[PDB]
DNA sequence: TGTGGGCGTGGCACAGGTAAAAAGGGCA
DNA sequence: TGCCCTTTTTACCTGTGCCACGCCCACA
């Protein structure tokens, strides 16, 4: 009868409690192959996994992961601990890590800036402004060996390696359906409970997701890009400029096999499809 | 009294970007 | 091997295709 160490839902049979931890566990799809740990990405799980191959690291106790050197693994521990050693002589701000802290002082007088020349960002050190101005170069140094495209970083060319794999790494215990992401594997569990955390300030309607929130909102703040450059109409979705540019040509793309009608959207030729069900 | 389709948007599982957290590593 | 900048990994954001609604209307 505890609270979930995930969730803090207040579960109160011991029973009843651990029924409710399997349900978190394909949150966590990365076993260590000699003690079992479970951990969200395979990157962690490496993180983790060093335990067992060096002898010269220092792993922390609350997550299992291990670093090279002692300082490394109490700047970790900050995580579990809220500690906040750096902070701020001029206004007394405290931050977990001294880069953070470093990154503040930008808005103080006197700090070494290094400023960008194609936008307004300004950055605490070099290797952060090189890094950013990447984005003004488009250079995307990892390839897929697979798809040609680049990515700013290894984890990037991986992660975008689901389109090349459709491997769908999380579990929902409840349905059984997979997800490949955690955080859509999350909303999914939110889906189930009806958690709608993300409430819209002005219908009050609430969203699992942060992206389903922000675009209904796109109605109350009249944002509507892709104007018609024939009849002017302006939509949301760069998807309905492609509908409605089939109403002036007279598209139909999608027609019914058996109708032998045609529609200029899919979700009619489901929708007629179905009366033939 | 009914059908059914345009239609503007909700639900969902998703990619790929930048901002930021977090682990790495050169100097000494 | 800690300071402190570098480099990697993750969180946060924005925009997406497909399907499904449920409202509005001409018109069986
Ligand atoms: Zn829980
Ligand atoms: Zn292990
Ligand atoms: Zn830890
Ligand atoms: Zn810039
Ligand atoms: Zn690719
Ligand atoms: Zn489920
Ligand atoms: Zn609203
Ligand atoms: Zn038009
Ligand atoms: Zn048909």
Do not use: W
């Not at 962690?44 to 335990?51: D, G, K, M, W, Y």
């Not at 984005?135 to 680049?150: A, D, N, Q, Y």
């Not at 491997?167 to 009806?194: D, I, V, W």
């Not at 009249?222 to 949301?236: V, Y």
Request: proline residues 4%; aromatic residues 6%; positive net charge.
């Amino acid at each position: 009868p505890h609270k979930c160490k995930e969730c803090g839902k207040a579960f109160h049979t011991p029973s009843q409690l651990s029924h409710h931890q399997k349900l978190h566990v394909g949150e966590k799809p990365y076993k260590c192959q000699e003690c079992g740990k479970a951990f969200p990405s395979n990157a962690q799980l490496s993180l983790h996994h060093r335990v067992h191959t060096d002898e010269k690291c220092f792993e922390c106790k609350e997550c299992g992961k291990a670093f090279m050197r002692p300082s490394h693994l109490l700047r970790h521990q900050r995580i579990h601990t809220g500690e906040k050693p750096h902070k701020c002589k001029e206004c007394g701000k405290a931050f977990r890590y001294d880069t953070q802290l470093s990154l503040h002082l930008l808005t103080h007088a006197g700090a070494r800036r290094f400023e960008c020349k194609d936008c307004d960002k300004v950055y605490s050190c070099a290797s952060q402004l090189a890094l950013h101005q990447m984005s003004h170069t488009g250079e995307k140094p990892h390839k897929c060996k697979e798809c040609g495209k680049g990515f700013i970083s290894d984890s990037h060319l991986l992660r975008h390696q689901s389109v090349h794999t459709g491997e769908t790494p999380y579990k929902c215990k409840e349905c059984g359906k997979g997800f490949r992401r955690g955080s859509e594997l999350a909303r999914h569990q939110r889906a189930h409970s009806g958690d709608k955390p993300y409430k819209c300030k002005e219908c009050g309607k609430s969203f699992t997701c942060t992206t389903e929130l922000f675009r209904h909102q796109k109605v109350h703040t009249g944002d509507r890009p892709h104007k018609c450059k024939e009849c002017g109409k302006a939509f949301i979705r760069r998807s309905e400029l492609t509908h409605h540019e089939r109403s002036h040509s007279g598209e139909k793309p999608y027609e019914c096999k058996e109708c032998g009608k045609t529609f200029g959207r899919g979700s009619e030729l489901s929708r007629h499809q179905k009366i033939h069900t």
